[PDB]
Amino acid sequence: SNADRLDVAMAADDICTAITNGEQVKGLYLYGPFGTGKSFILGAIANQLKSKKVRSTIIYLPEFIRTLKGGFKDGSFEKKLHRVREANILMLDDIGAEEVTPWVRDEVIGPLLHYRMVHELPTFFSSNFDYSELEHHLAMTRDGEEKTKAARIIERVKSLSTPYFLSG
Amino acid sequence: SNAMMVTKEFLKTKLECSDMYAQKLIDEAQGDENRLYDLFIQKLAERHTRPAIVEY
Ligand SMILES: Nc1ncnc2c1ncn2[C@@H]1O[C@H](COP(=O)(O)OP(=O)(O)O)[C@@H](O)[C@H]1O
Numbered sequence: 001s002n003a004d005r006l007d008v009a010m011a012a013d014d015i016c017t018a019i020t021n022g023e024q025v026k027g028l029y030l031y032g033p034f035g036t037g038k039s040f041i042l043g044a045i046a047n048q049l050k051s052k053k054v055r056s057t058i059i060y061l062p063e064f065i066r067t068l069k070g071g072f073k074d075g076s077f078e079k080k081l082h083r084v085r086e087a088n089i090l091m092l093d094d095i096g097a098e099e100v101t102p103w104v105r106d107e108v109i110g111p112l113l114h115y116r117m118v119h120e121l122p123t124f125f126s127s128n129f130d131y132s133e134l135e136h137h138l139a140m141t142r143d144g145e146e147k148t149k150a151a152r153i154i155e156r157v158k159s160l161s162t163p164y165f166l167s168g
Numbered sequence: 169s170n171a172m173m174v175t176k177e178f179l180k181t182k183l184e185c186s187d188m189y190a191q192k193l194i195d196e197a198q199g200d201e202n203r204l205y206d207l208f209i210q211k212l213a214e215r216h217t218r219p220a221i222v223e224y
């Protein structure tokens with residue numbers, strides 16, 4: 001895992017340096033067991049960029065989804081929510097840990113990911129799941145339509161990211 | 169119908185998570201109850217502490 005850590009460290013270094021130099025980059029999909037420092041590294045990237053006057057946003061997906069599911073009106077969340085899809089640099093922290101809610105998955109997340117895919121907006125992820133596992137998590141049921149929707153999501157995630165494993 | 173099923177539904181209920189995520193927690197604990205409980209509380213704390221969106 002020192003090797004894992006080294007690989008991810010130079011990935012993050014390269015990505016921050018490129019972003020700061022105004023280059024096109026692809027985000028990281030960081031995955032692995034609990035507590036290996038995935039969220040920490042996403043935070044380190046955000047703070048590194050901040051140090052260079054580059055903006056970025058980190059969504060904590062469980063609470064994002066909980067807020068959307070529960071409903072909201074006019075506060076900080078609504079104001080921030082309206083910026084997320086077109087944020088210059090976006091990170092989805094702990095995808096896989098949220099409650100799966102089809103309308104949120106398909107009306108908010110899917111379109112968001114499609115947008116960032118086609119406009120090549122850097123998008124990062126952390127998860128306890130690899131892409132295959134995440135695709136299965138995203139399907140609320142065995143139903144065909146669910147399988148198709150989940151597949152759409154995961155292909156967009158794959159187009160947007162390069163996967164890195166951080167070991168126990 | 170057995171302790172494992174119970175533990176899984178308990179995690180799904182209290183963390184409000186998917187079956188697969190709950191099973192990931194269980195697998196990670198590898199049969200150690202205290203380890204699973206500690207992990208549960210770590211994630212419970214994160215869930216109730218973190219804002220949905222943080223802008224940098
Ligand atoms: N490189 C690191 N240096 C110093 N503290 C760290 C580092 N990585 C993690 N910590 C801490 O270790 C704990 C677990 O890291 P975290 O990023 O939450 O794990 P996860 O991979 O599950 O997202 C956190 O308290 C986090 O702040």
Ligand code: BEF
Nearest residue numbers: 033034035094128
């Ligand atoms: F517990 Be972590 F966010 F994988």
Ligand SMILES: [Mg+2]
Nearest residue numbers: 038039094126
């Ligand atoms: Mg994390």
